[PDB]
Amino acid sequence: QVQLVESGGGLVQAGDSLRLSCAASGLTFNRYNMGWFRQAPGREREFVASISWSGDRTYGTDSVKGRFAISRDNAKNTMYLQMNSLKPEDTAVYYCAADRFLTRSVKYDYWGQGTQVTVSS
């Protein structure tokens, strides 16, 4: 079956940087758009960033585009999210997802279990 596994979460302090990764198996990795979503306490699940199989990057808002960077390594079936200047508001569970057509919609076909990021001040 298809399997997406996130890692790299933990407890950081405000202003820190953090790199999350996502490893995929059971699909032909280079034919899928890959996306990061998050769910903060008291909020709905929301789009963070996406990188399509042709390499175009799409970001959620101005709150994200300046601080976060997304990339993929097709040779290793892995994608990464680099997060800089983290704030308490970024505390959330971060999910990796894959889909053959979608970009910003939360209705992607495949989902990982998520990794938890806590940011304290």
Residue numbers in the entry: 1 to 52, 52A, 53 to 82, 82A, 82B, 82C, 83 to 100, 100A, ...
Sentences copied from the publication:
Here, a microfluidic device is described that enables the production of crystals by counter-diffusion and their direct on-chip analysis by serial crystallography at room temperature. Furthermore, the crystal structures of four proteins and an RNA were determined based on serial data collected on four synchrotron beamlines, demonstrating the general applicability of this multipurpose chip concept.
Final crystal structures were obtained either from a single large crystal and two wedges (Nb02) or from combining partial data sets from several individual crystals (RNA, CCA, Lip and PhP1). However, with a lower beam intensity (compared with XFELs) crystals can be used to collect more than a single image and up to several degrees of rotation. With very stable crystals, a single crystal may even be sufficient to collect complete data with the help of high symmetry and rapid analysis using HPDs.
